[PDB]
Design a protein around this ligand. Sequence first.
Ligand SMILES: *[C@@H]1O[C@H](CO)[C@@H](O[C@@H]2O[C@H](CO)[C@@H](O[C@@H]3O[C@H](CO)[C@@H](O)[C@H](O)[C@@H]3O)[C@H](O)[C@H]2NC(C)=O)[C@H](O)[C@H]1NC(C)=O
Ligand SMILES: *[C@@H]1O[C@H](CO)[C@@H](O[C@@H]2O[C@H](CO)[C@@H](O)[C@H](O)[C@H]2NC(C)=O)[C@H](O)[C@H]1NC(C)=O
Ligand code: CUO
Lengths: 182, 366, 211
Amino acid sequence: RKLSYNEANCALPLMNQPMRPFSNSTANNDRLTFTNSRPNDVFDYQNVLHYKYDTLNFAGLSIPQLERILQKNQGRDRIFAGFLLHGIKASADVRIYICVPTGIGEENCGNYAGIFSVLGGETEMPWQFDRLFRYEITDELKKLGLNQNSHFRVEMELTAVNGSKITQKIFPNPTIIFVPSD
Amino acid sequence: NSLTPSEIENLRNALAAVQADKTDAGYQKIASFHGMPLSCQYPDGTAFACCQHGMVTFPHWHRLYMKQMEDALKAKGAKIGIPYWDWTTAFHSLPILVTEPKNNPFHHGYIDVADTKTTRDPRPQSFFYRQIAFALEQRDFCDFEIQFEMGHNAIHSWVGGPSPYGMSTLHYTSYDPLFYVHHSNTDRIWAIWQALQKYRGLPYNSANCEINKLKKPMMPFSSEDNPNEVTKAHSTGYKSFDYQQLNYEYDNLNFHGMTIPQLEVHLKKIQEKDRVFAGFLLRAIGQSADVNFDVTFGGTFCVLGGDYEMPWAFDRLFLYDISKSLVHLRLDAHDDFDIKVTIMGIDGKSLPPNLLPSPTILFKPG
Amino acid sequence: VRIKLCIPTEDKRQSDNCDNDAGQFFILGGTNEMPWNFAFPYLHEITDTVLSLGLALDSNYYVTAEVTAINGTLMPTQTIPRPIVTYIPPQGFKDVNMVNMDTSSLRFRKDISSLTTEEEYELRVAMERFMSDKSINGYQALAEFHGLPAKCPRPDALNRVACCIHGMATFPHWHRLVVMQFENALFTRGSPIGVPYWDWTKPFTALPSLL
Ligand SMILES: *[C@@H]1O[C@H](CO)[C@@H](O[C@@H]2O[C@H](CO)[C@@H](O[C@@H]3O[C@H](CO)[C@@H](O)[C@H](O)[C@@H]3O)[C@H](O)[C@H]2NC(C)=O)[C@H](O)[C@H]1NC(C)=O
Ligand SMILES: *[C@@H]1O[C@H](CO)[C@@H](O[C@@H]2O[C@H](CO)[C@@H](O)[C@H](O)[C@H]2NC(C)=O)[C@H](O)[C@H]1NC(C)=O
Ligand code: CUO
């Protein structure tokens, strides 16, 4: 795509702090990983870490035809659910449901749309994503005969990894984004 | 069974009594209606056999027919109703009344039309139990009848065998005393079902399929020439559902060892295990024939029919569980199988091929 | 208190039809009010609207209450004990019959005193094995059903209460089921008997030697 592959414009203050365990003289004694503890140095894996992957085609698809798939995918109207995520005290599993009102009267709720996971543990370094995570709900809405204009909403249902132990709402309510055809 | 002499004793004489009335029928006219001598006419007045099997209104005609027959022993010490023998309950041999060689009215009948008494040729858990129970399982009346009629005629097939003059044939069956007695039972089965429905709140003295046909009146019971007022009164379809105004009673509508409520539990119990059935389309053919199944043995079932019978085609499929067959071959309704069949004529030959089309094969959980 | 008539939802979604309102009443009160409770239930007839929605008076539905304070403030449902539907059959009506006679075996629950020493030992063994030792299918789990590991409404999450029914018409249903659990548990561990009972109605001087 002729866009930067071994550099990152997006994050600037973060790319020059050497990795905390890898920069620590103890207990990292591997000089390879010690020397390249900075993120910028780890961008090109091949020159720096001296390894390759057998094939870089995904799902049996060469990168030209992969990019073709990607763009044709961009071709249609799509609908996404946005999630503003941040560090829970521990790891948890969020499921995604779509709420469709019946005519009379006010009405809910769930048909199963999706699922994604959040990782964590106590004593983790706190973190907050500065952008929405997206989840395509387009096809599920197609299966409900629903639209971007059609009336409905999206609820998350959050289940800890404790073993069930479902949690109350800790994340901001799901955004609904519409992307017009390419 | 359970008869107490002389309860047996009164009846033979009564059956003896009507052997010749013989004016009203006296018994031969009463015989003709199911039997060979021609009951009715197309408007072209062509011979028909006024037999009302093969249709959904199948029970009423008969259930009556017992009545006509039943009335016929009237005040001839017709002190109790025609008995029934529950062919469902497995049996090593045939029942006495119709066996005793000497001085017995149930051994045989005669046929002025043929100059002969009936001839019968019997042919070799209980099979009928399994077969009937299914019928009971069903809730639609129409669905029930197809199995109810087919479970039924399985006996007209096996009691008679290879004699034209016999129970295997439409033409002269009605002539053999064995026929009514088999009936009471068939009728009884129907009654049980009604009680079943009633238990289930489904219609029992009514029936929603098909509205067409219950309304068509029934000859001969229609005919002016039926000198019993009662049958004509219920000559119709929809009357004759409530057998109460007949008026008769069965000693007990319990299938062997079961309260009606008990029975549903049973069926409900059976229903747990997922089953697999085969269903055929069956349709008129002049001859009467038996059909033998295969995949191991899956068979079998029989169809009743004769020359000059009204043609008929069933609306619905006829189902026969073949699950035991699969286990026999260890199949899972998953591994896929060829359902092979055979179809013998009642006369010695000859297993002609369909005729019936192909069997569908369907799965019920569970 | 506004009376909403609800038709239950089958699915996970809260789709309970509470759209149609069945009734309405009012409550006078105040600060420095004299503390009070009607010794009898207040009944508000809903038969007509229940007939309007085409669902049998016998069939399943429930009733919820919207409590608006006179202040205009909408109030928590916790303020008032939940409404119930009371059904008055056409008198006289015989409920459906029991199944005829007995076949071919039923668990027999006897008076503890009626137990032979053999029976005592055998249900002692059954109890011994069920109790000892512990599992999900074991004694402690069933002992846990009734009260205080507090799994109600669900073992998750925020506020949990005991599962057993008390102060309700359904108390004996709940505990009947529970006793049946105990019964299966002891039968599968090898006891010929249903769970025996002890008549406390009969005047007794001491506890039965069994316990
Ligand atoms: C599995 O279930 C428990 C049930 O509560 C989850 O509760 C977590 O428990 C921790 C401490 O055990 C809670 O931390 C507390 O936070 C409050 C402020 O909200 C603070 O005042 C206390 O001093 C304490 O730090 C935490 O709130 C709570 N977290 C959540 C969302 O459940 C436990 O977290 C679950 N385990 C997993 C896998 O998360
Ligand atoms: C570099 O890492 C070492 C440990 O890998 C840190 O020293 C401590 O190691 C002990 C081992 O038991 C831990 O209990 C301490 O918690 C570790 N450090 C602490 C107290 O944070 C060392 O601190 C690290 N150096 C830096 C600056 O990260
Ligand atoms: O206590 Cu809830 O059962 Cu006696």
